[PDB]
Amino acid sequence: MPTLLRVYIDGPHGMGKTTTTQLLVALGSRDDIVYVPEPMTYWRVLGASETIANIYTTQHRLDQGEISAGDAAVVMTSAQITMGMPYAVTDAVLAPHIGGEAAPPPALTLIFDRHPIAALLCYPAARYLMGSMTPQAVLAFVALIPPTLPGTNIVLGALPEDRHIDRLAKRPGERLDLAMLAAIRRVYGLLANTVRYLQCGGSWREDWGQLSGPQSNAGPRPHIGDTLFTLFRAPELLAPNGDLYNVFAWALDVLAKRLRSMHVFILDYDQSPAGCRDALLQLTSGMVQTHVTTPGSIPTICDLARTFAREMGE
Amino acid sequence: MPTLLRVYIDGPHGMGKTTTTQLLVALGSRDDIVYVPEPMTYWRVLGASETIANIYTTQHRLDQGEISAGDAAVVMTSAQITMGMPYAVTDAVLAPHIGGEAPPPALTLIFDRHPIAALLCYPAARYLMGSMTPQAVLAFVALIPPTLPGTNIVLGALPEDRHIDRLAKRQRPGERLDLAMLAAIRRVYGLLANTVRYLQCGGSWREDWGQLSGPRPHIGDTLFTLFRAPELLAPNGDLYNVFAWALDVLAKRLRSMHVFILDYDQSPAGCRDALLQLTSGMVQTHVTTPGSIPTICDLARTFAREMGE
Numbered sequence: 001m002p003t004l005l006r007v008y009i010d011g012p013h014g015m016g017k018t019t020t021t022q023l024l025v026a027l028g029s030r031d032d033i034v035y036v037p038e039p040m041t042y043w044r045v046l047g048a049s050e051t052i053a054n055i056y057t058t059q060h061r062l063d064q065g066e067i068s069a070g071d072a073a074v075v076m077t078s079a080q081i082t083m084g085m086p087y088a089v090t091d092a093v094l095a096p097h098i099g100g101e102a103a104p105p106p107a108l109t110l111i112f113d114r115h116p117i118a119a120l121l122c123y124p125a126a127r128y129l130m131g132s133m134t135p136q137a138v139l140a141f142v143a144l145i146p147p148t149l150p151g152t153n154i155v156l157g158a159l160p161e162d163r164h165i166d167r168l169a170k171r172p173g174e175r176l177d178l179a180m181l182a183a184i185r186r187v188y189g190l191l192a193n194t195v196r197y198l199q200c201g202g203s204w205r206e207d208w209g210q211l212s213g214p215q216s217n218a219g220p221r222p223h224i225g226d227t228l229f230t231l232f233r234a235p236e237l238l239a240p241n242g243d244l245y246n247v248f249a250w251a252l253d254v255l256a257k258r259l260r261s262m263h264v265f266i267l268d269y270d271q272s273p274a275g276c277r278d279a280l281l282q283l284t285s286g287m288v289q290t291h292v293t294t295p296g297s298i299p300t301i302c303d304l305a306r307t308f309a310r311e312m313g314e
Numbered sequence: 315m316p317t318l319l320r321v322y323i324d325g326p327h328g329m330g331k332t333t334t335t336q337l338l339v340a341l342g343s344r345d346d347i348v349y350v351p352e353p354m355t356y357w358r359v360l361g362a363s364e365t366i367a368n369i370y371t372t373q374h375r376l377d378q379g380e381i382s383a384g385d386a387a388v389v390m391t392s393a394q395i396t397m398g399m400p401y402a403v404t405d406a407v408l409a410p411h412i413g414g415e416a417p418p419p420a421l422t423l424i425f426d427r428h429p430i431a432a433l434l435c436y437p438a439a440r441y442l443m444g445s446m447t448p449q450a451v452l453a454f455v456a457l458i459p460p461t462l463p464g465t466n467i468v469l470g471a472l473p474e475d476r477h478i479d480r481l482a483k484r485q486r487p488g489e490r491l492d493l494a495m496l497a498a499i500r501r502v503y504g505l506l507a508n509t510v511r512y513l514q515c516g517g518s519w520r521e522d523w524g525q526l527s528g529p530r531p532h533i534g535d536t537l538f539t540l541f542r543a544p545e546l547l548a549p550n551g552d553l554y555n556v557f558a559w560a561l562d563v564l565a566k567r568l569r570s571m572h573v574f575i576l577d578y579d580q581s582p583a584g585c586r587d588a589l590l591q592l593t594s595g596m597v598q599t600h601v602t603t604p605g606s607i608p609t610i611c612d613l614a615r616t617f618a619r620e621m622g623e
C-alpha cells in the first residue's frame with residue numbers, strides 16, 4: 001500500500017505556524033503535499049458569527065467584572081464546541097482511511113493547521129487557568145477527544161516569551177491579552193511534558209500523591225507536577241475524602257491514552273520564515289508514516305483536504 | 315475469551331425506563347448482570363449545579379421572551395456537555411475492552427442511556443425547541459464515539475397520552491412539565507428508529523437529499539430531514555461540505571447499531587419481562603482480556619455508587 005504522512009502544526013497562536021506551513025507546502029509539487037488550513041470561515045461565519053471576537057470579548061468583560069464566572073463559562077464552553085467542529089469532522093472522515101504505521105517517500109503528505117486537541121484540550125485548559133471555564137467542562141472535552149490515529153505527528157513551537165509578545169503585539173476579533181498568552185504557552189509546555197512523561201512510562205495514578213504544593217522526543221521523565229495532570233487537582237474535582245472523583249479519574253485515563261501514542265516534535269520559531277520552513281522540513285525526516293486502507297484512499301484524502309481548504313480557509 | 319452483552323436502555327424520558335430496568339436488574343445474579351444507572355449526582359452536583367433545573371429554566375425564559383434564542387443556545391450547548399460527560403467517559407474507558415461479535419454471556423451490562431442521547435437526541439430536540447443551533451447539533455454528532463460491535467439499544471413505544479401521564483408523575487429535580495419538549499423528544503426518537511432502518515436497508519442520504527426539496531422509510535421521515543436547516547446551507551441552497559461530512563459520520567455511527575423496541579404501555583413487571591424477552595435477539599461480543607470482565611464490573615458499580623441517586 002502507498003504511504004501517508006500526516007503532520008499537525010500546533011501550539012500557541014502568534015508564533016508563525018501558518019506562514020511556516022505555507023512555505024513548506026510551497027516546496028512540493030502540487031499534489032504530493034496538501035494543506036488543511038485554519039477553518040477561519042467556519043469560525044467567523046458558517047458555525048456561528050465571529051466566534052474569536054465572542055471569545056475575546058467574553059474574557060474582557062469577565063476581567064472587567066461586567067459578567068460572572070458562570071456566564072463566561074457557558075459562553076466559552078459553547079464557543080469551544082464551535083471552534084473544534086471542523087477538526088473533529090475531519091478526523092472522523094479521515095479515520096477509516098488510515099492503516100498501520102509504516103522508509104521511501106510518502107505518496108502523500110497532509111499538513112494540518114492544528115490537531116483536535118487544540119480545541120478539545122489546550123484552549124479549554126487555558127481558559128480554565130483564565131477563570132472562564134470550569135475544570136469539569138475541560139474534562140468533558142477531554143473525554144470526547146477522538147481515538148488517536150496511527151502516525152499522529154504533532155509539531156509544537158518554541159519561542160522566547162519576549163519575542164512571542166512582540167510578534168503578537170503587531171499582527172479575527174482578537175484582543176492583546178498577555179495573561180491568555182502566558183496561559184496557552186504554559187498549557188502547550190505542559191502538553192509536551194505530558195507526552196514525554198507517558199512515553200517514559202509515567203503512571204499518573206501512581207504519581208498523583210506527588211502533587212500538592214520543555215521537550216518531547218528527548219530528555220528524562222518529567223515530574224507529574226510539570227504535566228497536564230497538575231491542572232486537575234482542583235477542589236471542584238475532589239471528594240470530601242480528598243481523592244479525585246472516579247468520573248474525573250477516568251477522564252484522566254482517557255487523557256493518558258490519547259496523548260501517549262502521539263509523536264511530538266518541537267520546532268524553534270525564533271528565526272526567519274525561510275529558516276522555520278527548512279527546520280520543519282528537516283524535522284519531517286524523523287516522522288512516522290502510515291499505510292492507507294484502500295487504493296483510492298490517496299486521491300480521496302486529497303479531495304477532502306482541498307474541499308476543506310476551499311470552503312473553510314480564508 | 316468470555317462474552318459480554320451490552321444493553322443501552324434509551325428513548326424519551328418519562329416512559330418508565332428507570333423503574334423497568336431496576337426490576338430487571340433484580341432478577342439476575344448479583345454479578346452476572348450489572349446496571350449502570352442514571353448519573354443524576356453528576357448532573358445535580360459533580361459536573362455543575364442542578365443542570366436539569368438550568369436546562370428547563372432556560373427554555374422557559376426563552377418561551378417567555380425573557381432571553382434571546384442566542385442566549386438560550388449557549389446555555390443549552392454548555393449544559394449538554396455536562397449532561398453527556400458520564401456517558402462519554404464510560405464509553406471511552408470501556409471501548410478497549412470490547413472485542414468482535416461472538417450461549418449465555420459471562421456478563422450482561424445494562425446502561426441507563428447511550429451517548430447518542432446527549433450527543434444527538436436531546437440536542438436535536440432542543441434545536442426543534444428553538445434553543446440550540448443546528449451547527450452545534452452537528453458538532454455533537456461529529457464527536458459521537460465510533461460504534462463498537464454489539465451496540466444494542468432499546469427504545470420505547472408508548473402512546474402520547476399515557477406518556478404524558480407517566481411523565482407528570484415522575485418529574486426530575488428542576489424539571490418542568492413541557493408538552494412541547496415531550497413532543498420534540500418523542501419525534502426525534504421516532505426519527506432515530508426510522509433512520510437506523512433507512513440506513514440498514516441501504517439508504518444513501520446524499521442520493522436521496524434532493525427529495526427533501528422535491529423498501530425503506532422516506533428520508534423525510536429520518537433525522538436527515540432536520541439538517542435541511544437554512545443555517546447549514548450556502549446561498550445556492552447546497553449543504554456546506556463540513557455539515558455534509560458530519561451527516562456522513564451520523565450515517566456511519568447509526569447503521570451498525572442494533573435497535574429493539576420496548577412497549578412501555580404495560581405494567582412495570584410486564585415491561586421487565588418484555589425487556590428480558592428482547593435479549594435473545596441482541597448481539598454479544600467477546601472481551602479483549604481475561605481481566606476485562608472484572609474490570610467492567612468494577613467500573614459499573616463504581617459509576618453507580620458515585621453518580622447514581
Ligand SMILES: Cc1c(C=C(CO)CO)[nH]c(=O)[nH]c1=O
Binds near residue numbers: 013014118
Ligand atoms: C484553536 C483555538 C484557537 C486558535 C486561534 C488561532 O490560532 C485563535 O485564537 N483559539 C481559541 O480561543 N480556541 C481554540 O480552540
Ligand SMILES: Cc1c(C=C(CO)CO)[nH]c(=O)[nH]c1=O
Binds near residue numbers: 327352366436
Ligand atoms: C440525557 C438527557 C436528558 C435525560 C434525562 C432523563 O433521562 C434527564 O433530564 N435530558 C436532557 O435535557 N439532556 C440529556 O442529554
